[PDB]
């Protein structure tokens, strides 16, 4: 439900980092 509302699911822990589909706190996606 919060695909764009909330930030990435992990963000800092996320493995994608730059290749993430969600919105990051420091990166765009
Ligand atoms: Zn991410």
Short mmCIF file of N, CA and C and ligand atoms in Angstrom, two decimals:
data_model
loop_
_atom_site.label_atom_id
_atom_site.label_comp_id
_atom_site.label_asym_id
_atom_site.label_seq_id
_atom_site.Cartn_x
_atom_site.Cartn_y
_atom_site.Cartn_z
N UNK A 1 0.83 -1.20 0.00
CA UNK A 1 0.00 0.00 0.00
C UNK A 1 0.87 1.26 0.00
N UNK A 2 2.03 1.16 0.63
CA UNK A 2 2.95 2.29 0.70
C UNK A 2 4.15 2.08 -0.22
N UNK A 3 3.87 1.96 -1.52
CA UNK A 3 4.92 1.76 -2.51
C UNK A 3 5.77 3.01 -2.66
N UNK A 4 5.12 4.17 -2.61
CA UNK A 4 5.82 5.44 -2.74
C UNK A 4 5.71 6.26 -1.46
N UNK A 5 4.65 6.02 -0.70
CA UNK A 5 4.42 6.74 0.55
C UNK A 5 5.65 6.66 1.45
N UNK A 6 5.99 5.45 1.89
CA UNK A 6 7.14 5.24 2.75
C UNK A 6 8.40 4.95 1.93
N UNK A 7 9.57 5.15 2.55
CA UNK A 7 10.86 4.91 1.89
C UNK A 7 11.12 3.43 1.64
N UNK A 8 12.33 3.12 1.19
CA UNK A 8 12.71 1.74 0.91
C UNK A 8 12.42 0.84 2.11
N UNK A 9 12.31 -0.47 1.85
CA UNK A 9 12.04 -1.46 2.90
C UNK A 9 13.21 -1.64 3.85
N UNK A 10 14.42 -1.48 3.32
CA UNK A 10 15.63 -1.62 4.13
C UNK A 10 16.43 -0.33 4.15
N UNK A 11 16.57 0.30 2.98
CA UNK A 11 17.31 1.54 2.89
C UNK A 11 18.80 1.34 3.08
N UNK A 12 19.27 1.55 4.31
CA UNK A 12 20.69 1.39 4.62
C UNK A 12 21.10 -0.07 4.56
N UNK A 13 20.18 -0.96 4.94
CA UNK A 13 20.45 -2.39 4.93
C UNK A 13 20.21 -2.97 3.54
N UNK A 14 19.46 -2.25 2.72
CA UNK A 14 19.16 -2.69 1.36
C UNK A 14 20.44 -3.07 0.62
N UNK A 15 20.36 -4.12 -0.19
CA UNK A 15 21.51 -4.59 -0.96
C UNK A 15 21.60 -3.87 -2.30
N UNK A 16 20.45 -3.52 -2.86
CA UNK A 16 20.40 -2.82 -4.14
C UNK A 16 21.13 -1.49 -4.06
N UNK A 17 20.70 -0.63 -3.14
CA UNK A 17 21.32 0.67 -2.98
C UNK A 17 20.98 1.62 -4.12
N UNK A 18 21.66 1.45 -5.25
CA UNK A 18 21.43 2.29 -6.41
C UNK A 18 20.49 1.62 -7.40
N UNK A 19 20.39 0.30 -7.32
CA UNK A 19 19.53 -0.47 -8.20
C UNK A 19 18.22 -0.84 -7.50
N UNK A 20 17.78 0.03 -6.59
CA UNK A 20 16.54 -0.21 -5.85
C UNK A 20 15.35 0.43 -6.56
N UNK A 21 14.20 -0.23 -6.50
CA UNK A 21 12.99 0.27 -7.13
C UNK A 21 12.30 1.30 -6.24
N UNK A 22 12.43 1.12 -4.93
CA UNK A 22 11.81 2.02 -3.97
C UNK A 22 12.64 3.29 -3.81
N UNK A 23 12.10 4.25 -3.06
CA UNK A 23 12.79 5.52 -2.83
C UNK A 23 13.68 5.43 -1.59
N UNK A 24 14.96 5.75 -1.76
CA UNK A 24 15.91 5.71 -0.66
C UNK A 24 16.02 7.08 0.01
N UNK A 25 16.45 7.08 1.28
CA UNK A 25 16.61 8.31 2.06
C UNK A 25 17.77 9.17 1.56
N UNK A 26 18.82 8.51 1.09
CA UNK A 26 20.00 9.20 0.58
C UNK A 26 20.06 9.13 -0.94
N UNK A 27 19.48 8.08 -1.50
CA UNK A 27 19.47 7.89 -2.95
C UNK A 27 18.05 7.98 -3.50
N UNK A 28 17.94 8.25 -4.81
CA UNK A 28 16.64 8.36 -5.49
C UNK A 28 15.92 7.02 -5.60
N UNK A 29 16.65 6.00 -6.05
CA UNK A 29 16.07 4.67 -6.20
C UNK A 29 17.16 3.64 -6.51
ZN1 LIG B 1 16.42 -0.15 -1.34
#
